[PDB]
Design a protein around this ligand. Sequence first.
Ligand SMILES: O=C(O)Cc1noc2ccccc12
Length: 167
Amino acid sequence: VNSFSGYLKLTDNVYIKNADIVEEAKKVKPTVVVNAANVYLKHGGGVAGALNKATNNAMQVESDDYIATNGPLKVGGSCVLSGHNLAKHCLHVVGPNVNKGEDIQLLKSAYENFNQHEVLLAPLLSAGIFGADPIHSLRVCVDTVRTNVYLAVFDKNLYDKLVSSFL
Ligand SMILES: O=C(O)Cc1noc2ccccc12
């Protein structure tokens, strides 16, 4: 038994809810929140801009130190940093950005990072401002992630569409 409430169960391990991921993290304080990061950890908008704003820019300060030491992530890769006031940890995961012409096949690699964590609160990777088809992102999530994932869909009509079209 964990602290997540109100989710629709899609599979043995994947759950979904229409939610603002910033408000859900603040309420639950999960072990792991996933950020929809870019390779530079520049948290300007979408999930990253919203998560970073909720940390009063502390996420960006920590991220800039990480990049100054390590250089950029890979598309499909991740790093674990502080969750600040939102979570114990933040798993910054880079899905491909369709708008940058990045290979959609890297979405599966991105979701494989979730398997290193028993339970996660997450967005649909490459959805929203990343430009991928969110229905595809949910299919890759279900077919890739084996650990327990609680998905936060920001858009209502998208949430209702994801549910109603789920195989
Ligand atoms: O609903 C999401 O979580 C991201 C998203 N994916 O696609 C959308 C379209 C409009 C607004 C938001 C979105």
